Each structure stands twice: as C-alpha cells, then as structure tokens.
Write a protein that binds this DNA or RNA. Structure first.
Ligand SMILES: [Mg+2]
Ligand SMILES: [Mg+2]
Ligand SMILES: [Mg+2]
Ligand SMILES: [Mg+2]
Ligand SMILES: [Mg+2]
Ligand SMILES: [Mg+2]
Ligand SMILES: [Mg+2]
Ligand SMILES: [Mg+2]
Ligand SMILES: [Mg+2]
Ligand SMILES: [Mg+2]
Ligand SMILES: [Mg+2]
Ligand SMILES: [Mg+2]
Ligand SMILES: [Mg+2]
Ligand SMILES: [Mg+2]
Ligand SMILES: [Mg+2]
Ligand SMILES: [Mg+2]
Ligand SMILES: [Mg+2]
Ligand SMILES: [Mg+2]
Ligand SMILES: [Mg+2]
Ligand SMILES: [Mg+2]
Ligand SMILES: [Mg+2]
Ligand SMILES: [Mg+2]
Ligand SMILES: [Mg+2]
Ligand SMILES: [Mg+2]
Ligand SMILES: [Mg+2]
Ligand SMILES: [Mg+2]
Ligand SMILES: [Mg+2]
Ligand SMILES: [Mg+2]
Ligand SMILES: [Mg+2]
Ligand SMILES: [Mg+2]
Ligand SMILES: [Mg+2]
Ligand SMILES: [Mg+2]
Ligand SMILES: [Mg+2]
Ligand SMILES: [Mg+2]
Ligand SMILES: [Mg+2]
Ligand SMILES: [Mg+2]
Ligand SMILES: [Mg+2]
Ligand SMILES: [Mg+2]
Ligand SMILES: [Mg+2]
Ligand SMILES: [Mg+2]
Ligand SMILES: [Mg+2]
Ligand SMILES: [Mg+2]
Ligand SMILES: [Mg+2]
Ligand SMILES: [Mg+2]
Ligand SMILES: [Mg+2]
Ligand SMILES: [Mg+2]
Lengths: 126, 50, 119, 71, 52, 49, 87, 149
RNA sequence: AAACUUUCAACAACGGAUCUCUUGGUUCUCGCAUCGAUGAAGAACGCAGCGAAAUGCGAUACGUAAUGUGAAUUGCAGAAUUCCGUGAAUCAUCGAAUCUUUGAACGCACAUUGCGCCCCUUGGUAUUCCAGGGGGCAUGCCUGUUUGAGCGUCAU
RNA sequence: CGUGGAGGUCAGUGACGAAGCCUAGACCGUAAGGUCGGGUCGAACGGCCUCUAGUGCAGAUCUUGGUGGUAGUAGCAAAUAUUCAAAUGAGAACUUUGAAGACUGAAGUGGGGAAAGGUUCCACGUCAACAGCAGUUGGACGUGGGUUAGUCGAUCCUAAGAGAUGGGGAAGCUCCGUUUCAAAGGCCUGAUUUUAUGCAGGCCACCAUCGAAAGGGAAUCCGGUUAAGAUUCCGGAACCUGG
RNA sequence: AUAUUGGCGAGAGACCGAUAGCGAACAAGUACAGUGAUGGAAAGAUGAAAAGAACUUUGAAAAGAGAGUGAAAAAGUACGUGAAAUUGUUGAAAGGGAAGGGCAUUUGAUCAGAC
C-alpha cells in the first residue's frame, strides 16, 4: 500500500502518464536487466538501454538469439537489435520490435557518463 | 470585383494558399489519423463571406 | 554544425558584423539553390547561425548600457525590473515599516514577553 | 522571366512587401553593382511582391543572371 | 450537471397534421435543426428527476 | 508512392458512396423544415401556390 | 413577388469586416460592430448570452503573455541567470 | 549535406534525346537547338557550338567572344534542359563499401524499391545486387550512412 | 408440372444492436493567490529542408540564449566538434532576449496598407527640393520648474 | 421472476475456451422465467446471504438511426435540328478535325464594363465521385504559370448627412450640440550676424475630422508583342507638375 | 474564525460508459447556416507486430482465381463480436376471391428418456 499523499493509485492517470511521457522519461521507462555475470561484476541490477549494447533475447519466439542494438525507437516504445529480422521471399527484411524488459544486457557501452552513472548507483569499476 | 482593397486581396491570397490536398508523406507517419483535408474550400461549393 | 555562442562571445563588433554579412550571403545563395531543389538541410543551420550572432550582438550592447547606468536613479524602463503592475505599485519595505514615534515608544516600553504556565 | 532577359535588359525579383521602388533600386545597386533604369512592381495573387528591374545599356542582365547563378 | 440538456434553443411548432408537439431545435444548415429537444425521451435531452 | 496512392483510394470510398463531388462538398441537410411541417391552411391567404 | 424574384435584387452589403474582432459585423452606416462593440472602449458582452462569452473569453486565443505568469510566480519573480556545473 | 570531403561541380557534356520534341519559346533556345540538331548523335560541349570555335589564332579577343557566346548559350541550355530535349552526362567517383555493413543493414521493401525522382530511367531501373535484393537507392543510402566508406 | 405468393431450415447479403473495452466527462475534498500604458485579453497576416490543420512561434518566426540530462530524431533527408563530447533532442528546466500589423491603443485618420510635423545622420551641388536609416509628437489629473495674464491688489 | 452497481462467502467457472449471438435438439415451473446440448466467438463471468437504484415497453400524430411495399412504376415532352467520314481510344448519338443542313439577326445567342464572386483565366497530366442518358470531354480531379502606370482609377474636394473638442445633462452605460456662454492658430517681414532662426510687428472674422471607383478634377497616343498581360511591357513620338 | 459553478496545482468516488457522460473521448465552439444579434452537429475499436497480400494467370481497368503473411483474412485499411427489420440461392410444403388462431386426431419429417 502507498502512504504518500502525492502518489496516485488512479489507473486513468497512470495510463495517461505512460502514453504521454516525453523522450527523457521514455529513456528511463525503457530499462533492461543485466546478465548474472555483469550483475556479479558491477553490483548493478538494471540500466537504461543504449544504441551499442550487446543483448540476448530471453522471452518470445526469438528467445536465445544475440546481437547488438541497432536502434532505440523511443516513439514506438521498442528496441531493434541487429540480426533479428523477419525476411520475405522478394528479398525484403523488416526488423522485429522488441521490448527491453524481455532482454538481457551481456556487454555495455562504457564511456565517461556511464561510468559516472554506475558509480552513482553504487557499483564497482575495477 | 476587379477594383478591390488590399484587405480583400490579402484574405483572397491566404485562401488561395490554403487550397491544397493532403501531402502524401504525412500518410506514412507513425500513428497517423489524418486521412483527408476536412477543411477544403471550393469557389462554387461554399462561399467565403468576405 | 553551425556557430557556437561561447566562441562568439570572444569576438568584437566588426568581427560579428562581418560574420553576419557572410551568413546572409550564404542564405541568399541557398535560396537560389532551393528554387531548383526541394530538400536542402543546410538552410536550417544557416538560419540558426544568423539568430545566434544577432543574440550575441544584442546582449553585448545591453551589457554596455547597464554598466553605463550602474547605480543611478532613473534607469530606462526595459532595464528596470518587471514583476507585475500591482507589485510595482505596492509599498516598499521602508514605507511599510514606517512607524509613529508614539507607537515606537510604546513598543519599546511594553513588548510582548515570553512566558510559560507549567511551573 | 527568362524571356524578358533576352528582350529588354529586365531582371525579375521577389522582394519584401514592405519595400518601395526607391529601396528596390538602392538594394539592386548595392548587391549587384549595376545602374538601374526603371523599376516596375506588382503584388501577386499568392501575396508576395514581384519587381521588374530594367538596367541601362552600359550593362548586361545576362552577365548578372550568370553571376547570381540560375542560368 | 445541473445545466445538462438545457444548453439549447428550441420551441414547439404547434398542433398540425404531420409531426408531434415536442420542442424542436431551430436554425438551419447543420443536421441538428429540426430535431427534438429538452425531453426525457429525446436524444440529448435532460433525464427524468436529475440527481442532486 | 504507390503505397500512399492505394491508401488515398481506400480512404475516399465512403465519401464516394455518399456521392460527394470532392472533399470540399460539405452540404448538410436539416432534419425537418418548418415551412413544410408547420402551420395550417384556412380560407384566406395561403403560403404557396 | 416577395420570395425568389426579390431575392435577386440582393447585391449590396450591410456589414463589412471589423478591425478589433475581425468577424464581418461592422455596420458601415452606423460605424459600429454589432459583435464586439467597436469603436467603444469596452468589449460588448451580456449575461443573458453565456454561450457567446464562452466563445470569446480568455483562453480561446494564444495567451501570448498570460501563459508564463504562473511559472514566473512559482519561481518567485527571480532575476539574473543560472550557474553551471553544480560547483 | 555538411560533408567536408565532397566534390561540387557541374557536368560539361550534354546528350540530345532525338525521340523527344517540344516547341520552345526562347529564340536563342531555338537557334541553339538548330545547332545541336546539326551536331549529331554524340556528346557535345557548349563550347563546340560556337562560331569562333575552333581557334585560328591565340589572340584573346577570340577568347572574349567565345566567353560571350557561352554566356548566351547557358541561357539557351536552361530552357532546352527544362523540357527534356537534352540531358547531361554525369561525373563519377569510385567508392568502396564494406560487405559486413551491407549484410548487417536491412531494407523494408527489397525488390520493389526504385528511384522515381531520377531523370534518365536506365539508372533508376537498375539492380546492383539482384539475388540479394538491394536496389540503387538503397545502395546509395548504405554508402552515405557508412563512415568506413 | 412449373412459375408466382406465403411458411419453415441452412448459407450468403443489408444494417450496426448486444457484449467486452476507455489517454473523456461528472461530482466531492485539500492547497495557493499571480493580468494590463515596462502595452493585457482578443484579432489579422506570416514562419518548418519537404505541412492543409491541431499544437508552437514573430522577419532572430514549429524558434535564439542560459541551466540540467547524456545519444537521439525518424515518413524521408541530414546530424565530428552528433559522438569518452564544453554534447542529440517536437527532451526537461527557464532567470537573457527577439516580439510583424493591430487591439484600452496614444501624431491625425481608417470601407484607405491615406496624410503630416520635430531631432540626428547618410546619399543626391541644397537650412528651403527629393530619398534612405534611427529616435519622437494622445487625453484627464497630482507635485515641482519655467514663461506669462488680470487697475484683483500692496509698497515705492 | 428479471436488470446495473456494493459488502460477505463458495481456497466458485474460465485459452482442454468467459461474456455475447444463432439454433425444423432436450428438460423443469400455472407463469414471470430457469437449465442442458450443438454452432459461432476469443477474455472475462457466476450461485447463495444481504445492501442500493438513472431497474422490466407495443403504442405517447414519442426521440434518434436503419429498412420496406408502392416500383424497374410516375417520369427524363418549353426555347424549330440534325447528318456523313476519318482520327483517338478497351469502348464514341454526345470528344477533335473535315464535309453538309440550320439558328441568333446589330432593343443579338455579338463586343465591353458597374455591383457581386475569387482563380472560375491558361497550359500540362488525367476519370473513382459530379455533369438526373453517356463521356476518351469539363467551370470536375492533380501540378504549375499568369495581373508591370508621373498621364487610367483610388488617394484630394465638397453634397444630403455623420461626428470629437469647449461646455451642459444623466446613478450610469452614455445624451445634446458643430461654432457653440473657450485665454481655441499661423504666415512671414524681422533685425540679419552668441548667429542662427527666442521676441519680431504686421496679422489672426474662418474653427477638427469623415462623407461620391456615375458629381468636381494637372498631364499619352500609335504600331507590335503572350498559352494566358497591356492607354501599364517593347519601339517610336508627346505632354504635365515639382525642383 | 466565514464565502468561493472563475484561475493554478493535487487527491478521490456504492457516478456515466460512445443515442450515456459536458454541445465536444476524434484537427469541437469545429464543419455548416444566417445581413446581423446569434444558432450549432455527425464522427472511438485490423493485428502482439503492417508482417497491409511479393509472384503467376484472365481482364482495357476496377477486380477475379491461384499463391503467400499471420494463431486466425469465418481479422483485407468496406477491417473485434456482427442482432432485427429487409433481401438472394438451395431444400421441404401449402394455395378455386386474404393470411394468421383454439380443441382434437391422421399423414410426413425429426427427437430424448429408458429397459
Ligand atoms: Mg459563416
Ligand atoms: Mg500599381
Ligand atoms: Mg445528455
Ligand atoms: Mg435594390
Ligand atoms: Mg443601408
Ligand atoms: Mg496557427
Ligand atoms: Mg507587443
Ligand atoms: Mg475614403
Ligand atoms: Mg502647476
Ligand atoms: Mg446504474
Ligand atoms: Mg449484477
Ligand atoms: Mg481455475
Ligand atoms: Mg462460449
Ligand atoms: Mg426458429
Ligand atoms: Mg438467475
Ligand atoms: Mg460474488
Ligand atoms: Mg428510467
Ligand atoms: Mg428497451
Ligand atoms: Mg419499440
Ligand atoms: Mg401499453
Ligand atoms: Mg424516423
Ligand atoms: Mg415508363
Ligand atoms: Mg412532362
Ligand atoms: Mg425543345
Ligand atoms: Mg446531342
Ligand atoms: Mg425566327
Ligand atoms: Mg434567320
Ligand atoms: Mg439601342
Ligand atoms: Mg478553361
Ligand atoms: Mg486538359
Ligand atoms: Mg451522368
Ligand atoms: Mg458514367
Ligand atoms: Mg484546376
Ligand atoms: Mg454626438
Ligand atoms: Mg475625404
Ligand atoms: Mg470621384
Ligand atoms: Mg454638377
Ligand atoms: Mg484580355
Ligand atoms: Mg513606352
Ligand atoms: Mg455524445
Ligand atoms: Mg451531441
Ligand atoms: Mg440566404
Ligand atoms: Mg466496429
Ligand atoms: Mg475476428
Ligand atoms: Mg457493412
Ligand atoms: Mg433476417
């Protein structure tokens, strides 16, 4: 149960906030868990997903496949990993839209800001 | 009326630039609900009223 | 692409005017090319560069005028602060705290004390 | 507009709605370094302003049109 | 809402040979003009004994 | 281009079935006419010939 | 001949465009707008017409200045600028 | 674009399309089209349609008269090109695209995409890679989006 | 006997009920006090690389500056100083600016994109003629300043 | 007996198929109704004990939406009138050109304009809807091009009239009035040399402003030119005002 | 201490569920009407994902038939489910100036229980 008077348990308000969230809020809404290896390595459970991470699909028809993120489509609430596509007989290939909560990050894209963010969340870097 | 004022000619120029169908690249957008121009005007169909 | 305001702030007046007329010539020839081609994605960057240069020139002149009117009574009305019309018309703290000598002596003699009942 | 160049030394420009014939003549002399004989103007049915600028015979509009860069 | 089913301008056309005597929306050119109004049996009208 | 063309052709269908002569034809018919469904006729002056 | 033959003699105008409200309600012989009341200083509105007040009230336009007053109040009518780096 | 390592230039050779015909409005365009039809079925430069060409001396008055002729001929060619009576022959640059980039990036409509904005149709109705499903527009978008090109 | 009419059943039409849904409405409670001559509310006309609206904005025109976040936007095009960055973006924040023609609307007028006057400057040989740029010129009232009026009135 | 919600219970039913809908199948009740099978469908819903109501329709010349018979019926009959060949095209009573026959008959079915409309003008592409038959055609649909002035108008003047100011009414929104019972404003000579323009030394009777694209009014003609513009563009030849 | 159908920010309900609830769940004070003051609508739902039907063949074409995508086109931008009025085809029956109903049985068709 909630205790604060500023939190709302209203389904209409929650659904309106989700469907009219802006881009910088959609960044945090599209978060993905780490692997057990990276979790034991870094001390972090989940991170927001980025355009050059190597993931693994753990749910759905494409469960078991790997690849790099090629696009993070924040408008369509989805992510597009390379080499996970549906092909046609005339030679076309459309990408599959995946949700990031049904993926596992296996390798990060580490720069200055992500190192600061992991140290902010209270992980280790050595 | 072939001898008009600048105010009338200005409103006529805006109404001329507004008279177009829908651009086709707008139909291809993500979650597009505009299917036609619902405010199209024609000279013999409906009048401008100055 | 485009100009950067932190790099424009290290320049002077005639240098900013020269950069302004260069960008204006470039926008002119880009409109000439747009007459033949519909999609030209450099027009947006040249327009934002012109707006940035104009912003920096205006803020330099306004800073000069503020230093010229520093400290004086009767500054110009746009350099004056704008809260609201009612806030500008209200009394100041000095006029609000003006007090008669009779009341001032009364507040000196008998101010409200601190006390407790408990013991 | 192309026909008028090889006809009467006439360049055709789109100008601001706030400009008059003195300002048009002065701006053409400033921008292209020529001498102007005449300026005729109209307001178009789409709401813009168009000027026909006739140059003097010691100048050629074909040269300016090549410089500007649309011919 | 205390004004629901009352924000319209309508008048009864009278006793005649064709239509019933409900108040009807006047005007022209919209599809709503000529339609019945204000009754609890009319579409868009007020309800019987509105809740307080 | 042919995708958007087929889109527009499938979208104009119901307007075509209502026989509008374009997207600018928006004539609205009223429900009932007062001059056709009001009044009575006496022995004096009448409303139509 | 009070109907359709006399509807053919209908080619002048009683009202033209207004300058304050822009509506075509400006009577040319009265020199008065029958909608906004121009050129009177006060804008014409009545309490027996509430739908017209609802049509022309505040918030039906752009609100070019009033839409920022609540933010300026909440921030406290501050002046100056912001500092960098949180340092 | 904003690319710094690019070339920007106009072609200098033109090609007459003899299966097209359209009466022009400019008198210089009509005279120049008479010269072009006299020239033949080979690519031509605008300098070759001059009357001062070829040079019988090295004196620069023939250069000045040829440049004035070119100034008139550009105005003629502007209307001859507008009505598809004549087309330009293009300038090319050899360019390298990585195969792993080609096979990693994907097309939504493989076989059915073409240009529809080009003017020559033999480029535009061409498949570079037929049994992979990549067209000319998609191949040039891959070449533009690669940084290792 | 068929056809035709009517009844009964299966399938197919016409039409949009019922069911399931819901980024909307409606009512109640809590907290707060902030429009305008420093030009408001409202109006007109414009502005996007490719838009008619809705939503934004004013010739710096779907925006400029500053501050935060930290890699997108997406229909296409295009983003190295877009990229281990003094940095995407219809992102959030917003304290600096810009703010056409109007409107209480303020030089006069306005069914007109009409007509003036003053100051500084630049160009035409020019205090007198013409043109461009910049800055001004409403009414009522209050306090003060200056110039005045009246045998209203005092001393010379 | 039945319906929408609420509290409790059946650790109730349900993707091995909830609710709804159809059913020349089955059973129970005097009845309101309840229950089972089959088909269709794809995500929620019941029994009992209680609480509550915007709780049950054949009608109101009821409201809104939909659909019939009449019925392939009435009708598509004012304005004297059409025919032949070729071309185009999937297709021609109706489009284009040619060959014929007619009509308007200069108070024309001709050539221009004023109110009003607003791009309908013209070119290219082109037929789903519209043109009460048709359509390859169009004032339709899609994309563009086109309106050039010292002399033509407006702008200026006043007409019938409208209307501020100074004043005077009215609780007030506002009313009267237009030179009024007001200290109502300009030309210049000055003198000319802080020298630039303070007084000038004579004036000053009129009182704002709006009101005519047919009244009053400074000045332009001819020839050529476009797909579409011209007393405006080009060529030639004039005139008027101001300096 | 009291008022508050406006403005700004929040939290809720034995409230309504697209002919209801505000006129407006959607580019709604919009489209459209009127000289004017004013009057004033209709209109939500493919699918998890457009993967929105490539290719062959008949046709001038719209389209059809194959094929294909999909869990399903008994989901094809006329798109969840698809009632009634009204209509088409097939099967069964009746019919010498209406049709329908009650009691009773014959004929044909069809059907459950059960020993
Ligand atoms: Mg209207
Ligand atoms: Mg003119
Ligand atoms: Mg209601
Ligand atoms: Mg008359
Ligand atoms: Mg009148
Ligand atoms: Mg807008
Ligand atoms: Mg302003
Ligand atoms: Mg006038
Ligand atoms: Mg005083
Ligand atoms: Mg209820
Ligand atoms: Mg219930
Ligand atoms: Mg279960
Ligand atoms: Mg079921
Ligand atoms: Mg039955
Ligand atoms: Mg029951
Ligand atoms: Mg229960
Ligand atoms: Mg009831
Ligand atoms: Mg009922
Ligand atoms: Mg009924
Ligand atoms: Mg009854
Ligand atoms: Mg009905
Ligand atoms: Mg018949
Ligand atoms: Mg008849
Ligand atoms: Mg006849
Ligand atoms: Mg005929
Ligand atoms: Mg005769
Ligand atoms: Mg005759
Ligand atoms: Mg005569
Ligand atoms: Mg035509
Ligand atoms: Mg044509
Ligand atoms: Mg027809
Ligand atoms: Mg037809
Ligand atoms: Mg057209
Ligand atoms: Mg008066
Ligand atoms: Mg006048
Ligand atoms: Mg006149
Ligand atoms: Mg006379
Ligand atoms: Mg003509
Ligand atoms: Mg001439
Ligand atoms: Mg409703
Ligand atoms: Mg309604
Ligand atoms: Mg009418
Ligand atoms: Mg539906
Ligand atoms: Mg289905
Ligand atoms: Mg249907
Ligand atoms: Mg039925």
């Amino acid at each position: 149960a909630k205790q604060s008077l500023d939190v709302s348990s209203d389904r209409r308000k929650a659904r309106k906030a989700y469907f009219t969230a802006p881009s910088s809020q959609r960044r945090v809404l599209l978060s993905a868990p780490l692997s057990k290896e990276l979790r034991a390595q870094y001390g972090i459970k989940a991170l927001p997903i980025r355009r050059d991470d190597e993931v693994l699909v753990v749910r759905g028809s494409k469960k078991g496949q790997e690849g790099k993120i090629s696009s993070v489509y924040r408008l369509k609430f989805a992510v597009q990993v390379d080499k996970v596509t549906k092909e046609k007989v005339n030679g076309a290939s459309v990408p599959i839209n995946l949700h990031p909560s049904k993926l596992v990050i296996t390798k990060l894209h580490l720069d200055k800001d992500r190192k600061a963010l992991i140290q902010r969340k209270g992980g280790k870097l050595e | 009326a072939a001898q008009k004022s600048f105010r009338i000619k200005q409103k006529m120029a805006k109404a001329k630039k507004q008279n177009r169908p829908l651009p086709q690249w707008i139909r291809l957008r993500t979650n597009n609900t505009i299917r036609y121009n619902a405010k199209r005007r024609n000279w013999r169909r409906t009048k401008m009223n100055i | 692409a485009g100009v950067k305001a932190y790099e424009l702030r290290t320049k002077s007046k005639e240098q900013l005017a020269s950069q302004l007329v260069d960008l204006k010539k470039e926008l002119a020839e880009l409109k000439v090319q747009k007459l033949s081609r519909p999609s030209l994605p450099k027009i947006k960057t040249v327009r934002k560069s012109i707006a940035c240069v104009l912003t920096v020139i205006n803020e330099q002149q306004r800073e000069a005028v503020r230093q010229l009117y520093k400290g004086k009574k009767y500054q110009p009305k746009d350099l004056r602060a704008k809260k609201t019309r009612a806030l500008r018309r209200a009394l100041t703290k000095f006029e609000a705290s003006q007090v008669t000598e009779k009341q001032r002596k009364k507040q000196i003699a008998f101010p409200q004390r601190k006390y407790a009942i408990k013991a | 507009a192309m026909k008028k160049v090889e006809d009467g030394n006439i360049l055709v420009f789109q100008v601001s709605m706030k400009a008059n014939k003195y300002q048009i003549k002065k701006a053409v002399k400033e921008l292209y370094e020529v001498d102007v004989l005449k300026v005729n103007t109209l307001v178009r049915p789409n709401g813009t302003k168009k000027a026909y600028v006739r140059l003097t015979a010691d100048y050629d509009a074909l040269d300016i049109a090549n410089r500007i860069g649309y011919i | 809402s205390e004004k629901a089913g009352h924000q319209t301008s309508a008048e009864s056309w009278g006793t005649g040979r064709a239509v019933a005597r409900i108040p009807r929306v006047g005007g022209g050119g919209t599809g709503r003009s000529g339609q019945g109004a204000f009754g609890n049996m009319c579409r868009g009208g007020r309800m019987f004994a509105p809740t307080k | 281009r042919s995708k958007a063309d087929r889109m527009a052709k499938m979208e104009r269908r119901e307007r075509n079935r209502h026989a509008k002569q374009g997207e600018s034809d928006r004539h609205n018919a009223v429900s009932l006419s007062k001059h056709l469904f009001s009044g009575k006729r006496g022995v004096g002056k009448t409303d139509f010939r | 001949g009070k109907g359709t033959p006399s509807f053919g003699k209908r080619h002048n105008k009683s009202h033209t465009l207004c300058n304050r409200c822009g509506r075509r309600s400006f009577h040319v012989q009265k020199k008065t707008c029958s909608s906004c009341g121009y050129p009177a200083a006060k804008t014409r509105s009545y309490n027996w017409g509430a739908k017209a007040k609802r049509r022309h009230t505040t918030g039906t336009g752009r609100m070019r200045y009033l839409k920022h007053v609540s933010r300026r109040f909440k921030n406290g009518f501050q002046t100056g600028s912001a500092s960098k780096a949180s340092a | 674009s904003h690319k710094a390592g690019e070339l920007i230039a106009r072609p200098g050779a033109y090609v007459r399309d003899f299966a097209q015909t359209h009466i022009l409005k400019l008198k210089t365009s009509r005279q120049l089209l008479t010269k072009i039809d006299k020239q033949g079925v080979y690519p031509f430069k605008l300098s070759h349609l001059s009357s001062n060409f070829p040079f019988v001396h090295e004196n620069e008055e023939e250069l000045q008269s040829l440049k004035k002729d070119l100034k008139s001929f550009r105005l003629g060619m502007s209307e001859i090109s507008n009505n598809y009576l004549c087309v330009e022959s293009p300038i090319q640059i050899a360019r390298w695209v990585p195969w792993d980039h080609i096979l990693k990036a994907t097309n939504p409509n493989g076989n059915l995409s073409y240009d529809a904005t080009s003017t020559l149709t033999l480029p535009g109705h061409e498949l570079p890679l037929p049994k992979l499903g990549v067209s000319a527009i998609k191949l040039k978008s891959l070449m533009n989006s690669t940084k290792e090109s």
